[PDB]
């Protein structure tokens, strides 16, 4: 007994059989090729000053405006940790690549471009709208991601120009509601603004495609709850104004119902691929798991195309030279193995999702249950990397990870610690600005103390401290064990160096929809720990208090 | 040459004459006796370890449950900075005081007790409902404040037992809405909960009064807006869900329309008078300025008693052995000088208030305007001590100090910095938990940088930095220049070492009603700087940019 | 003006394209002050007035 994903699946099926193949899936065999780990961050062990020199232009060069990297003739003109490179994703519609000073984090761009240009049937993108800090209401992507996507689609149009059939391209973003600059009473104006920015995004794509092409491209926005004054559709015990809105938070790039990129990354260039990068993780996986991703998309897209009534969302499509309202509610989820699909490491994988709070029935939150069960059944260790574990409610109330039929994450971690299981946690830093941890390490320690004081344990405070001091270690991310304002956006956990989650579902609470996958494989986990967990942990900071 | 409060009054009267004697008042002569500065905080220049020893009890003593201090036989049994003392505010209804290890912060208790037991007509208490951290739903006061109030009222009842007339005692709290444990759709249940806690508080007071006495005691709660989805009644340019609720935030203890305690202190014992105190300031003043506070009280109580329209507030009275709904809507505001009123330092003072967002007309926010004018017309220096200068909106949007007809606080400070005025700022620490500054120093620096980039300055970024580097110094509060998690709740500013504000109005934005006073006097300002500003500044921590 | 300060209600809708971008900049006002073009006085000079009906939901019912 060292936790198996089949146990998670069986538990969900016993308790939530009506959501089988809606918010979770039977484990399936999938394949991880070299580079499947899309971990982006500053280079652990160096300094921010040095890493950030990777974006300084030298020797009669400039900073390219599309990709926000220095131009380039050879490695000697590139500073920091960067090198001169001519990536395919810089190839514009006329076929010309650029020489840029690239860094390891750009691997994510490489992964996206390569996957999209290979499409023969469908490109399915789900994400979170870029935050409106000040700028102009951007959609779907920002910075280098945008150019990358455009360039990919351009290439795709050429690769498919003789295709028997058209390629369906779906871009869908969850949108904050009420939107920046509008009270919740102004739904109509909100829709108009969303429509405008989506139209501009689509028109920009269109202007880099051949006049005649086989790409049917749709852009859409999805929000499922704007009530604020009442429940969105969940079984929470906690109540807060900030839990009474909801929209998609899942992050998927799904090509041909075969290749999936999923994890914590939004497609926000400045946050990941420029100075002072935020630490984040996605993965690139091939196999039947893509079916689940597609179902997830289809759920959302079905909701966008047909919901009537309550909230009203918006979308538009460009195909055969025309803007239309042909809504792509459904891409087929039936898996067809591509040739040489079994290349790479075979691993067992299931999906888990959160699709309640206004899309599906209020019981449809199987992600929380899955992770609580995982932690409750850890036998050796739980490694967690997150942005935050708690979330500040509207009037300062601390909101904790949500209640499930099996309890909360914090109750499960308390159980683990009481049993002697090691719990290592990495949060973002407190001085993380937009990506703050929200609460310091002492707060989490004391919260778990209080859990052990109540409940079935009834432990006296100092005796409980013994368990915590032995088995709980809370650190926050740092590039080098010195800097105290670095940032992380991870949604990662690993049980027994064997089973791990990658997806969008923070441990801190919200009502947003989520998608993620659970991998069960010792070899894959060992790779992930060698590449990300161990360097990050080694360089993290611990506040003793 | 320097700033004169009369110029502030003249500006408000020219632009908002219809709110004269409503939200502001003509400067009047008032009196500050020794002890007028009720600044409570740990002992600057020491350490939290040392200060917190003030609440250690020896084995043969204990920690009194009413006042959360150690019992006591002589000074040698008291640790830290405490001494053995038998304050009058420990005197219970039977006339028995306790020996406790008291600290300098307890001065605020002394001021409340002493002021209340001297009443001959009225006791008028306005405050903010205790935060609900634990689903306890306390009212009006917590910790040693509760006992103090009770004991004061007990003593008051004896001091007035042969009075020709009854004494009006009003206790009014602004209540968070929606309340903890309730979505906003549940107004009725919320009112019931408020009524329950107010009834228990009043019954507790009654149980320590004589069976027959001349006190008419009313407890009440006030909220002026619970919409969430639309404007509460202001002229803001910013829009945010968290600005669309409102309740009283003003803090007043007004005895006989003569003696006023006002400032930033909520009546929350554990936050000020125990270990790890929050730094805060109130003042004890006597004179016609009390009129203005009484008026402020009246405006709220009227609103509660004559339930205008939609929102329903709640209150209850205990008098002549009976609970009733006799609503004390009006205490007379005409000032009558007590005998020996001219004792102490004579100073010019005016009131300023914020009574919009559902109580009075939406234009009735003269506090913001007055402070903007003061900063814009500073000639030498501006000293600011705040908890925070910015506030995080519902979905992460930064909310800045609100717009007035004369612009914002940030625009005024940018103007002062551009002209060469010195601007010293102390905030709470970032790691201050519930009393966090919310944003780091660099964020403030950069916000003001962007203000200087815009019209009318149009300063290039690097050159604008030189203005900030020369004239702006932002620190955060620390007991000793070493600890980084200390906390401040100040709402203080001082212009030209002459004019200073004491009251409830944070610089960071909200829609809550506020009351405060502006004192114009070099002698008083110098006493305040010696006692509070200079020690705090010398021990504050500067994070270089 | 009516379209710009009552957009959304009924069936009133608009969009602008400018500088390669779609926006909701609403051209509620072109200047009505007349400037004679050069050689404007070419042709037959005639006396003309305008008359309009801006009733029925746009301006006052009169
Ligand atoms: Na990154
Ligand atoms: Na990073
Ligand atoms: Na570069
Ligand atoms: Na999609
Ligand atoms: Na993909
Ligand atoms: Na949660
Ligand atoms: Na106390
Ligand atoms: Na005390
Ligand atoms: Na302060």
TrEMBL record, chains A, B:
The EC number(s) this enzyme carries: 3.1.4.4
Disulfide linkage: 72-84, 78-101, 225-232, 305-327
Superkingdom of this protein's organism: Bacteria
Top EC class for this record: hydrolase
Entry keyword set: Hydrolase
Protein known as: Phospholipase D
């Amino acid at each position: 007994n060292e936790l198996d994903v089949n146990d998670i699946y069986d538990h969900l099926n016993e308790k939530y059989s009506q959501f089988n193949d809606v918010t979770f899936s039977k484990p399936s065999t999938n394949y991880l090729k070299p580079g499947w780990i899309l971990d982006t961050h500053f280079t652990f062990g160096t300094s921010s000053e040095f890493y950030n020199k990777s974006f300084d232009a030298l020797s009669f060069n400039h900073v390219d405006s599309e990709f926000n990297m220095s131009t380039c003739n050879d490695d000697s003109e590139c500073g920091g940790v960067s090198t001169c490179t001519a990536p395919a994703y810089t190839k514009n519609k006329d076929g010309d690549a650029k020489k840029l000073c690239t860094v390891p984090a750009d691997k994510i761009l490489d992964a996206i471009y390569d996957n999209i240009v290979s499409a023969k049937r469908s490109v399915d993108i789900v994400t979170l709208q870029p935050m409106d800090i000040s700028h102009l209401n951007l959609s779907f992507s920002s910075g280098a991601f945008t150019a990358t996507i455009k360039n990919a689609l351009s290439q795709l149009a050429k690769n498919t120009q003789y295709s028997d059939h058209h390629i369906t391209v779906r871009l869908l973003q969850g949108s904050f509601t009420p939107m920046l600059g509008y009270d919740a009473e102004s739904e109509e104006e909100e829709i108009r603004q969303l429509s405008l920015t989506q139209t501009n995004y689509l028109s920009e794509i269109a202007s880099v495609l051949p006049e005649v092409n086989n790409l049917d491209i749709t852009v859409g926005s999805v929000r499922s709850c704007n009530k604020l004054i009442s429940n969105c559709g969940n079984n929470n015990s906690q109540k807060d104004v900030l839990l009474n809105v909801a929209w998609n938070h899942g992050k998927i790039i799904n090509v041909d119902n075969q290749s999936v990129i999923t994890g914590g990354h939004n497609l926000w260039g400045a946050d990941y691929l420029q100075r002072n990068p935020v630490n984040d993780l996605s993965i690139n996986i091939l196999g039947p798991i893509a079916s689940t991703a597609t179902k997830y998309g289809n759920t959302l897209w079905n909701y966008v195309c047909n919901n009537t009534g309550t909230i009203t969302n918006t979308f538009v499509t460009y195909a055969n030279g025309q803007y239309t309202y042909d809504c792509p509610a459904h891409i087929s989820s039936t898996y067809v193995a591509p040739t040489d699909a079994k290349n790479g490491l075979a691993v067992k994988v299931m999906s888990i999702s959160k699709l309640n709070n206004g899309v599906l029935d209020k019981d449809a939150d199987q992600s929380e249950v899955a992770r609580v069960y995982a932690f409750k059944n850890a036998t050796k260790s739980i490694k967690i990397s997150q942005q935050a574990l708690f979330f500040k409610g509207a009037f300062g109330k601390v909101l904790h990870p949500l209640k499930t039929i099996d309890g909360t994450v914090m109750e499960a971690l308390a159980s683990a610690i009481y049993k002697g299981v090691t719990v290592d946690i990495v949060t973002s830093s407190l001085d993380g600005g937009i990506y703050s941890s929200g609460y310091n390490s002492e707060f989490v320690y004391n919260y778990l103390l209080n859990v052990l004081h109540k409940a079935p344990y009834y432990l006296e405070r100092n005796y409980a401290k013994t368990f915590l001091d032995k088995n709980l270690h809370i650190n926050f991310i740092s590039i080098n064990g010195r800097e105290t304002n670095n940032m992380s956006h991870n949604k990662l956990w690993i049980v027994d160096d064997k089973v791990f989650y990658v997806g969008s579902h923070n441990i801190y609470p919200s009502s947003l929809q989520q998608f993620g996958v659970i991998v069960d494989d010792k070899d894959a986990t060992a790779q992930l720990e060698k590449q990300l967990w161990t360097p990050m942990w080694k360089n993290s900071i611990h506040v003793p208090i």
